[PDB]
A paper describes a structure:
Our study reveals how [name] assembles over 40 mt-rRNA fragments using exclusively nuclear-encoded mitoribosomal proteins and three lineage-specific families of RNA-binding proteins. Cryo-EM analysis of the mitoribosome structure demonstrates how these AP2 proteins function as RNA binders to maintain mitoribosome integrity. The mitoribosome is also decorated with members of lineage-specific RNA-binding proteins belonging to RAP (RNA-binding domain abundant in Apicomplexa) proteins and HPR (heptatricopeptide repeat) families, highlighting the unique adaptations of these parasites. Our results reveal the structure and composition of the most fragmented rRNA mitoribosome to date.
The LSU was resolved to 2.89 Å, and the entire mitoribosome was locally refined to three bodies, the [name] head, the [name] body and the LSU, at resolutions of 3.6 Å, 3.29 Å and 3.11 Å, respectively. The [name] harbors two particularly protein-rich regions, on the top of the head and the bottom (foot) of the body. The foot domain is formed by a cluster of mainly two large proteins (mS138 and mS142) wrapped around two short [name], one of which was assigned to [name]. The [name] presents an extended platform and very short helix 44 (h44) that harbors the A-site (decoding center), which is universally conserved across all ribosomes and species. The universally conserved three-adenines bulge forming the A-site is formed mainly by [name] (harboring A23, corresponding to A1408 in bacteria) and [name] rRNA fragments (A7 and A8, corresponding to A1492 and A1493 in bacteria, respectively), with minor participation from [name] 5’ extremity. On the [name] rRNA, [name] is the center piece that goes from the body to the head. In the body, it interacts with [name] and [name] to form the A-site. Moreover, the entrance of the mRNA channel is surrounded by the mitochondria conserved mS33/mS27, the C-terminal helix and an unstructured loop from the species-specific [name] and the universally conserved uS5m. Also, uS5m is substantially enlarged in this mitoribosome, as it has acquired a large [name]-head domain and N-terminal and C-terminal extensions on the [name] body.
Residue numbers in the entry:
A (entry chain BK): 1 to 198
B (entry chain B3): 1 to 90, 96 to 106
C (entry chain BC): 36 to 101, 146 to 169, 185 to 240, 251 to 273
D (entry chain BH): 1 to 125
E (entry chain HJ): 1 to 40, 62 to 98, 590 to 867
F (entry chain BL): 1 to 103
G (entry chain Bl): 1 to 200
H (entry chain BF): 1 to 210, 234 to 294
RNA sequence: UUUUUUUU
RNA sequence: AGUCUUAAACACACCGCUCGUCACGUAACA
RNA sequence: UUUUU
RNA sequence: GCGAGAAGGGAAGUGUGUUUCAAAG
RNA sequence: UAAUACAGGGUUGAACUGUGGGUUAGUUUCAAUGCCCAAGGCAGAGCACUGGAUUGGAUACCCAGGGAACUGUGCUCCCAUUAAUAAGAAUC
RNA sequence: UCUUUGCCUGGAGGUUCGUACAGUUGUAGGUAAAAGGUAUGUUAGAGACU
RNA sequence: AGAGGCUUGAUAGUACUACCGUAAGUACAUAAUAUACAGUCCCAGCAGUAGCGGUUAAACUAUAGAAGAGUCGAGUAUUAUCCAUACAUACCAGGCGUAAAAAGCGUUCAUCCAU
RNA sequence: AGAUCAUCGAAUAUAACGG
RNA sequence: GGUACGAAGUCGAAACAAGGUAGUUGAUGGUGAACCAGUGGCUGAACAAAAA
RNA sequence: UUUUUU
RNA sequence: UUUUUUUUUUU
């Protein structure tokens, strides 16, 4: 009835989804795992070393570009590596006997099993910067919270139609730091709604 | 209480779908395989009939009043074609009375 | 006064934070330094996209500081076009130019930005034969070309010609 | 105002082609807005009564539900910021009576002026 | 509004309101105006045009389609396999064989019991109400009777199949407006839900929802009946609840206005001219149109170089370059060799050691 | 008394505007002009109901004062309040007369 | 509909139309809103329940402190109330006894001893936990229930190296007449920890 | 405070009571995970190793483990992706229109512009697998620089470098222009992969599948089995929950032995 | 490869 | 005697259903 | 309360 | 010399309160 | 409920009028039968009342006599309360 | 579809111009089914006929 | 069972703010039951509108009736209180045939309604 | 200084000034 | 005097269906208990019931 | 105290 | 449930 060969149509939205009797059918799905753990442990040591050696030449952003790592992911590698080494050199406790919540214990098992089947990743595979793309991220993505409407209705006419009312930013209160001392911390309360600045 | 809505659920508003529309959904849903005659009717869909009856209208019969005057002046029209069926005098298209009016 | 947490089988799984962000303005925004900053899709995650980071970066840079009626319209349009054209001496694409006529069009190109920044004329090369024609969007020519006074007059006619059919009074 | 509420009974018919309606100044303006949205095929003022045609599609009519909000005995008013809450996530048609004539609910929010909800077309709950 | 005494002594524009002198366009008023123009050109009517050649010269053509003696003289002279189960099943038994029985689901509602009086004692016969319908776009309710509860269930399901009706459901799984339903005391209000949230209803009636094919909805029963039993009235509520639903494709066709969703952009209204722009052109007639069409003098398209694309296998990821770091080259070499293996990589092994 | 959320609804705001006039002025019709330099002005007010969302009307008869005694019975006039008490009944002052009844 | 709103007096006609009364708390109305009220008994009789319920139910007319008399039921086996006895009543309706809409409270009342025989319901019968019953809840030692399966497993992988309790390693588990020893670390872990802790 | 539940206390799995049924008594049974659909991406070992030499030969992979850790490097996806590429770019392949119409069609099929990573499909400087040979798109090149460069380049790069194969094919692109060409021999080979169609084929492997009543029933249990959204949440204290598992360590084994004790003893004295 | 599966 | 039509407050279906005076006992408006 | 088997 | 009912429910129905404005002893 | 006198309502024709209205208390007429009071009588009917029937154990059923009640400008509306169970406007 | 008047909230119950005028459903001892009805059966000194 | 109060005849969908099939206390140890059985027998009782108790019913008493089958937990449970969960306290959001509800028929005052 | 619904107890209504 | 509930005895056959010779109602009269006689109104009324 | 095991 | 942080949408 209509021609639209693209991948952002109503029917093409959320491809490979159960629409019918297949919703109740059990299906296995891949297990997610953070990128900072899938990398080769060997490379983590190397990356940490560089960071700790010369932060100027080896910045947080430049270091992650060569190995293809995000600015946030590379930060955790140094932080997690530091603590592991600190307890070994100082002869405090072994990493295996370290106390940690159950959420991390299950994560460690997955990391070991991930490599035992496929293997560790020699180089990360992720983009440093994001990209505006059409994807389904939760139920709050395909909804307009400003006008609170799902279906947009407009008049059909060839002539220029009047534009819609643009929204205004929401003014909220914030706090800033002016003077900081060991025995006292002074702060300032900002009120954007005040006409007189002074 | 009971069917007290002249303008409401009393008057159904169910969409009328032909065979072309019904078959298109079943085949797509995967419930029934595509028959050999599915494409035959696709190129020549049937003509809509619901909208044709809307043009029907009722008109007033003017022969009831006009024929009264004709017989009054010339009441010798009932003799012709008297033994034939359909004619009553207590008329057929072929009757003189209908021809003149 | 609440601490949400899972209470079911799925007690350990990736739970990414989502920050819905609708369109900031429905009006058509131009490209900043040639980089488009228009919205492509409505689905936006918490992480700021590089395209949006450019618009917000430049926002903080802007400082807070800074008879008949028909006959009159044409009368003012001609006067304004002539006055503006004479200031440079003492938009549509498809403007061809010859190789040997580059100096003649170079001064005109650079002179339109001083009085009409909206002009976005382009340059198209062609076999060098002394030709200099300026075409419009609809495919109509507005200036056809066959001590220093002759050179100045040639450029004067071109500046006013484009403004005559572009200016709105 | 009373004659305005008498148009829903005539326009809300299934097995019919054209229905009459009492002539009124306010009623004429309402029909203009509905025709723009494609709800009424056409209308004609036949003197003391107005003849309005009915639109049908696949048997069923285009109009399926009519709700009268405003009544002669009272008056419903909503602020520009309150109409959005009422009307949200819907395809319905609300007739708004503003100072500058009569317009739909979509245009009322654009101007930000306080209108008056008269009637509802193709509205659910 | 507020026709008080004070308002009545101020809204009077004049002492007399001459309504008979008003100027309103009537039917006879316009008729007289046209007739006055004709100097001393009147109303006329036209009769239907009856032509015999319309059907006389066309009916003969239809005869050629059936003039054959083998198609004119004649007039005017139980099991189906179920491969994963493998057992005989009744096919017809008053049921359409065309419809697949391995794609539908049933949900038992209730099993009521009745009483019958006779000359000797009492006779009891069971009954059931089984709703059968595909969980994609179909729904149906059937009712029957039987001597025993087991037989009643089977008979009730039979009627549901034979009374299957289509629904008007959105492609996008998003309703327009909330529908409401009634029969006597009952109210069944269906509250829509956002896309990607799932269903939310009573656990008892949960299966029912699925059977309907409705996604992202909150179905609640507001007192199905306040007297007697509540199963019979409830049967008719479903029927006159889903008929009121309307999809985008319905409203847009009659509304002739923008009726698009938020995520997609102009999917149903956008109709590119695929029979005017992509029209075929041969090399034998192209030379004739070059001297007649406008010469190409424009600049608005840069990506205008494409032709018939032939499927070709490429590996952009594994492409050594002069700017890649030494570590990247090494890492890609090992990865490439693993995917090209056809002896170890494309194999499934249960145990870890070669047992 | 009205709640905080009841002071922002269109129904209450519209009623308020009708009642509210410059200098707390009022509109009413005279019903008694027997005593010298005295006229009783009957004013009509409005109120809003947050339960059924309906506005009613209730008359408010008050006494006024006239200098030239131009106003007569059945004549809509304008009144203005005052920050004192003059006479036993007099509580208002005339400004002008809008409509005049024949004799 | 909105037919009931017509008229300028809509604010005085609609609101005066009360739907119904308050079905809940309709029987217990003589308490003056108090949870409980004390009273004194002046009449003891046995009221026969209505048909088809047979048998006999013991009842007594208790005079409330507010100068009102109402019948009260005495649930539970036995009977101790007599003439001029103080008893605390509470809420509760009795279907078998017509009119009675109150119940007595055992224990807190005056001159009302504890029930005769009851173990299941403790709070209801205001019965305190007896010392004998409390001691029984602490005895938990029934783990030694070996079977033939354990015997075979023990003499396959746990008979070569196994330390006994007193002073010896090598034992004789293969003998049928002998009994396999118990675990000295896991068996009876909960009972051992509690007994060894209270001994201080 | 809120103590015990006041209601039906229906089970999480959604099963009925009665004899000859999983559940006997009414209860919640929150601890029973067996009834809940769960994946198995780990491995299980055997109870006894017959091998004399201690070795981990009893380790076996799980059925769900293969699909739990997939790898987007298998060979049988590129072939399918290549075929879909031709069918996806057909709207512009058969579009015999001007540059303006062709450019718009390609934009919708693949978003690409300034500051965005595009696939390079349709650009003048890109190699495509055309059905028949065709000349490059030399229309965008300047005419002034090419004309002046043709003389200084010399005969070496005027008739043997690029012009030797610039007119070997009958067909061409964007018309014909024998005067304007590229004397330099710069090969515009290589291409880029798409980010939309490639991600769809890769995820296709995660949805693959290998007196009776006419109409099959739909038990409630089925719904709750796979889906975890419609399942009632836990309310008991964690401490109690954890203690329940510890209790069963020594309790459970006793129940099994107590049952067989009576049956085994009965046969040894009567049977 | 750590008193890992394993549990006051 | 076997059917048809109509009525019915019964359907353990006319051995059905149901009402009133008087006699004894327990109580709230006294 | 006690505490590297 | 300065401060002190800092422990007040006895009065009132169109009142006590609320809202809109105003106040260079 | 034939004749005659007084004065209403409905249908149609002409003239005039040029928004005159729907509902209705602190309101006003009429209103079967029965009862008080009053006027009354000489016909046809009958409650109470000893006037000829009951029973298979109790009765007013079936005859006859029989002093209340049956025409009011009045006092006066209790009812199964006088032409359906809505006083108005719009869709044929 | 719209304007206005009037009326009801399961069934059910009350001490043993002045003897005038006005006015009235409601503060219980008690109860869990009163009731409209489509169809079947049965009864009928109630009508008809093999 | 680091530890006590309730239920143990049917009936009740057992709560909702992040996540919304994108995952293990996943496997061995480690699997069972209470509509088995004991006492009284229109009597003693239980209970929630409907009810059970006679010849023995998972409905009354009893858990050395078995390391109680379940829900809470250092509390649990009964009564009581209010705008008492759509018994819609009825604009949203109930009526005036038979069922609880339209004044015997009519002209007028005020208010509301109307072109 | 201006404006600013009254409700319960079943109910029982015309009152005060000058010839 | 009258009314509620429980048990249950004697004296009677009023309602159902034309047997009590139709039966509820407004106002009276009368009778150990069903209630009965007369007038008005209603059906919540049974049987019977036209050619020249 | 045993069994299993990158 | 963050070694050198009193910062951290930790999960």
């Amino acid at each position: 009835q209509n021609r639209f060969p693209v991948l952002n149509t109503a029917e093409n939205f959320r491809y490979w989804k159960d629409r019918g009797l297949d919703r109740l059918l059990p299906r296995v799905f891949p297990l997610k795992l953070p990128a900072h753990r899938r990398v080769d442990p060997l490379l983590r040591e190397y990356i940490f070393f560089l960071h700790s050696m010369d932060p100027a030449r080896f910045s947080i952003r430049k270091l992650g570009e060569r190995y293809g790592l995000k600015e946030r992911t590379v930060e955790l590698i140094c932080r997690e590596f530091s603590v592991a080494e600190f307890l070994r050199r100082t002869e405090l406790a072994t990493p295996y006997t370290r106390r940690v919540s159950r959420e991390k214990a299950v994560l460690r098992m997955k990391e070991a099993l991930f490599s035992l089947k496929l293997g560790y990743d020699q180089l990360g595979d992720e983009d440093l910067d994001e990209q505006e793309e059409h994807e389904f991220r939760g139920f709050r993505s395909t909804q307009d919270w400003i006008q609170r409407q799902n279906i947009e209705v407009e008049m059909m006419s060839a002539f220029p139609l009047p534009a819609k009312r643009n929204p205004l930013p929401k003014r909220v209160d914030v706090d800033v730091t002016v003077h900081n001392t060991p025995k006292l911390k002074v702060m300032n309360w900002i009120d954007p709604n005040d006409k007189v600045v002074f | 209480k009971g069917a007290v809505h002249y303008t409401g659920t009393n008057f159904r508003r169910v969409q009328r779908l032909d065979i072309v529309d019904r078959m298109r959904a079943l085949v797509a849903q995967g419930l029934v395989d595509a028959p050999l005659w599915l494409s035959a009717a696709e190129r020549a869909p049937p003509m809509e009939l619901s909208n044709l009856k809307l043009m029907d209208r009722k008109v007033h019969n003017k022969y009831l009043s006009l024929t009264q005057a004709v017989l009054k002046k010339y009441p010798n029209m009932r003799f012709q074609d008297c033994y034939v069926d359909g004619n009553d005098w207590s008329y057929r298209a072929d009757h003189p009375v209908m021809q003149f009016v | 006064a609440h601490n949400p947490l899972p209470r079911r089988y799925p007690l350990y799984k990736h739970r990414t934070l989502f920050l819905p962000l609708s369109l900031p303005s429905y009006s058509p925004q131009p490209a900043i330094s040639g980089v488009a900053v228009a919205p492509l899709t409505i689905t936006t995650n918490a992480a700021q996209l590089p395209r949006t980071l450019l618009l917000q970066s430049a926002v903080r840079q802007l400082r807070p500081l800074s008879s008949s009626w028909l006959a009159s319209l044409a009368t003012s349009l001609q006067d304004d076009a002539a006055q503006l054209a004479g200031q440079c001496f003492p938009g549509t694409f498809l403007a061809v130019y010859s190789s040997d006529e580059f100096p003649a069009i170079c001064v005109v190109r650079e002179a339109l930005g001083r009085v009409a920044p909206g002009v976005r004329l382009a340059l198209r090369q062609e076999a060098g034969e002394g030709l200099l024609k300026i075409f419009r969007d609809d495919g109509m020519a507005v200036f056809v070309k066959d001590t220093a006074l002759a050179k100045r007059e040639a450029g004067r006619a071109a500046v006013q010609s484009i403004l005559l059919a572009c200016g709105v009074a | 105002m009373q004659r305005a509420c008498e148009m829903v009974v005539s326009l809300l018919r299934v097995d019919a082609l054209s229905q009459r309606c009492p002539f009124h100044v306010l009623n004429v303006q309402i029909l203009d807005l509905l025709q723009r949205e494609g709800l009424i095929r056409g209308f004609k003022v036949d003197g003391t009564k107005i003849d309005i045609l009915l639109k049908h599609y696949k048997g069923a009519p285009v109009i399926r539900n009519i709700r009268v909000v405003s009544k002669p005995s009272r008056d419903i008013w909503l602020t520009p910021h309150e109409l959005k809450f009422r009307t949200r996530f819907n395809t319905g048609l609300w007739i708004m009576q503003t100072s500058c004539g009569v317009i739909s609910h979509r245009d009322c929010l654009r101007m930000g002026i306080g209108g008056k909800m008269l009637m509802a077309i193709n509205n659910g709950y | 509004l507020h026709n008080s005494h004070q308002a009545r002594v101020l809204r009077r524009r004049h002492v007399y309101r001459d309504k008979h002198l008003d100027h309103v366009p009537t039917e006879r008023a316009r008729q007289l105006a046209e007739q006055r123009s004709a100097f001393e050109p009147h109303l006329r009517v036209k009769l239907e045009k009856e032509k015999f050649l319309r059907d006389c010269m066309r009916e003969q053509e239809n005869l050629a389609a059936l003039f054959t003696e083998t198609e004119k003289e004649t007039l005017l002279g139980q099991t189906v396999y179920d491969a994963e189960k493998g057992m005989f099943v009744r096919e017809r038994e008053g049921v359409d064989p065309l419809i697949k029985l391995h794609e539908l689901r049933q949900t038992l509602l209730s099993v009521s019991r009745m009483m019958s009086m006779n000359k000797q004692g009492r006779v009891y016969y069971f009954r059931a109400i089984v709703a059968v319908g595909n969980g994609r776009g179909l729904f149906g309710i059937g009712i029957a009777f039987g001597p025993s509860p087991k037989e009643a269930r089977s008979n009730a399901a039979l009627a549901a199949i034979q009374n299957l009706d289509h629904i008007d459901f959105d492609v996008g799984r998003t309703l327009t407006t909330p529908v409401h339903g009634s029969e006597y005391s009952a109210h069944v209000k269906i509250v829509p839900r956002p896309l990607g949230k799932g269903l939310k209803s009573n656990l008892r009636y949960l299966p029912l929802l699925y059977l309907m094919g409705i996604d992202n909805c909150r179905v609640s029963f507001y007192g199905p009946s306040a007297s007697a039993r509540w199963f019979t009235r409830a049967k008719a509520l479903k029927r006159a609840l889903e008929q009121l639903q309307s999809r985008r494709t319905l409203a847009n066709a009659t509304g002739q206005k923008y009726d698009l969703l938020v995520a997609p952009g102009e999917h149903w209204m956008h109709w590119p001219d695929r029979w005017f722009r992509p029209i075929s052109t041969e090399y034998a007639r192209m030379l004739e149109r070059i001297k007649k069409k406008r010469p190409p003098s424009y600049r608005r398209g840069f990506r205008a170089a494409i032709d018939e694309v032939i499927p070709e296998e490429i590996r952009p990821e594994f492409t050594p370059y002069t700017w890649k770091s030494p570590l990247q080259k090494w890492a890609e070499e090992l990865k490439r060799k693993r995917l090209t293996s056809h002896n170890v990589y494309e194999t499934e092994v249960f145990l870890h050691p070669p047992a | 008394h009205y709640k905080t959320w009841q002071r922002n609804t269109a129904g209450y705001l519209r009623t308020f505007m009708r009642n509210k006039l410059p200098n707390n002025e009022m509109i009413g019709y005279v019903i008694n002009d027997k005593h010298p330099k005295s006229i009783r002005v009957a004013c009509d007010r409005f109120m809003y109901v947050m339960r059924y969302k309906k506005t009613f009307r209730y008359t408010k008869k008050v006494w006024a004062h006239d200098e030239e005694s131009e106003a007569r019975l059945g004549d809509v006039v304008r009144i203005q309040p005052l920050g004192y008490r003059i006479g036993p009944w007099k509580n208002y002052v005339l400004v002008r007369v809008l409509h005049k009844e024949p004799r | 509909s909105t037919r009931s709103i017509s008229g300028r007096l809509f604010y005085k006609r609609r609101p005066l139309q009360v739907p119904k009364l308050k079905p809940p708390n309709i029987r217990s109305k003589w308490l003056e809103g108090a949870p409980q009220k004390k009273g004194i008994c002046v009449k003891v009789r046995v009221q026969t329940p209505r048909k088809p319920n047979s048998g006999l139910r013991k009842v007594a007319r208790v005079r409330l402190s507010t100068g009102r008399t109402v019948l009260v039921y005495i649930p539970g086996i036995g009977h101790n109330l007599n003439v001029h006895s103080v008893v605390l009543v509470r809420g509760g309706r009795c279907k078998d006894v017509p009119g009675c809409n109150y119940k007595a409270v055992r224990g807190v009342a005056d001159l009302l001893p504890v029930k005769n025989r009851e173990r299941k319901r403790s709070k209801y019968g205001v019965k305190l936990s007896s010392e004998k019953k409390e001691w029984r809840l602490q005895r938990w030692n029934n783990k030694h229930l070996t079977i033939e399966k354990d015997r075979e497993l023990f003499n396959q992988f746990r008979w070569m190296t196994w330390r006994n309790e007193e002073g010896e390693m090598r034992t004789s588990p293969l003998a049928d007449d002998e009994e396999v020893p118990r675990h000295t670390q896991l068996f009876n872990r909960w009972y051992r920890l509690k007994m060894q802790r209270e001994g201080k | 405070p809120r103590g015990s539940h006041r209601g039906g206390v229906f089970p999480v799995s959604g099963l009925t009571w009665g004899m000859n049924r999983p559940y006997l008594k009414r209860g919640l049974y929150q601890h029973r995970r067996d009834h809940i659909f769960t994946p198995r991406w780990g491995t299980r070992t055997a109870n006894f190793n017959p091998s004399a030499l201690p070795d981990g030969s009893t380790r076996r992979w799980e059925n769900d483990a293969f699909k739990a850790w997939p790898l987007y490097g298998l060979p049988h996806h590129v072939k399918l992706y290549a075929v879909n590429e031709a069918r996806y770019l057909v709207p512009a392949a058969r579009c015999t229109a001007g540059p303006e119409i062709t450019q718009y069609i390609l934009n919708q099929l693949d978003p690409g512009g300034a500051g965005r990573n595009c696939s390079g499909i349709g650009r003048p400087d890109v190699r495509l697998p055309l059905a028949k040979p065709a000349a490059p798109s030399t229309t965008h090149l300047p005419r002034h620089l090419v004309q002046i460069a043709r003389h200084v380049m010399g005969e070496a790069g005027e008739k043997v470098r690029r012009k030797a194969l610039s007119f070997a094919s009958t067909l061409s692109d964007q018309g014909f222009s024998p005067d304007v060409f590229d004397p330099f021999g710069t090969p515009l080979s290589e291409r880029s992969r798409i980010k939309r169609l490639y991600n769809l084929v890769c995820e296709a492997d995660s949805w693959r599948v290998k007196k009776a009543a006419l109409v099959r029933d739909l038990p409630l249990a089925e719904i709750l089995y796979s889906r975890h959204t419609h399942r009632l949440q836990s309310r008991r204290h964690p401490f109690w929950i954890d203690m329940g598992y510890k209790k069963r360590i020594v309790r459970i084994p006793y129940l099994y032995r107590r049952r067989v004790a009576k049956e085994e003893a009965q046969e040894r004295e009567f049977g």
